[PDB]
């Protein structure tokens, strides 16, 4: 719905996707329909990007949450600098946070179990502040994203 472009909803999507990547399913009601659709599409993109950019991603060391945040923001700035927003690009934001959390799992100097909650936070900040209005104008997650990507 229209409120799904606010921070809390986006944060939950970003956190759900990281928990998917880290293989830690949380008990309870289960992920939303949006999150269920997003996890499949984002993961497919993530594995493609990990293959296409493997030589490059191996030359970056994600050793702290602060390095993950700076790198994420640097990459997002360049990805979106042409002013174009579309649902495919929004999916890649989740794919990239999944790449970052996997690198952190291996490389983080002082690992902390709450790190994926910090990553999710700065991902939601970027999505809301830089794409939130476009998301709302295009139907939000329920009437835009899910309609584009759910099964036929």
């Amino acid at each position: 719905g229209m409120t799904d472009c606010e921070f809390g909803y986006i944060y939950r999507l970003a956190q759900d996707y990281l928990q998917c990547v880290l293989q830690i399913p949380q008990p309870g009601s289960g992920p939303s329909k949006t999150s269920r659709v997003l996890q499949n599409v984002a993961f497919s993109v993530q594995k493609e990007v990990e293959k296409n950019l493997k030589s490059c991603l191996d030359n970056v060391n994600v050793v702290s949450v602060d390095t993950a945040r700076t790198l994420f923001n640097q990459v997002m700035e360049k990805e979106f600098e042409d002013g174009i927003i579309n649902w495919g690009r929004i999916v890649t934001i989740f794919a990239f946070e999944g790449i970052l959390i996997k690198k952190l799992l291996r490389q983080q100097i002082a690992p902390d179990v709450d790190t994926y909650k910090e990553i999710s936070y700065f991902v939601a900040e970027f999505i809301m502040n830089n794409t939130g209005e476009w998301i709302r104008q295009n139907g939000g997650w329920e009437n835009g994203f899910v309609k584009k990507f759910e099964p036929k």
Binding site: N52, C56, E77, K78, E79, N86, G88, R89, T92
Partner: peptide, 21 residues
């Protein structure tokens, strides 16, 4: 350079997914 390469790879993948998804 690595920032630019990663960003360009993500942009390309997203624009491809947009048209083929």
């Amino acid at each position: 350079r690595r920032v630019v390469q990663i960003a360009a790879g993500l942009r390309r993948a997203g624009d491809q997914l947009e048209k083929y998804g």
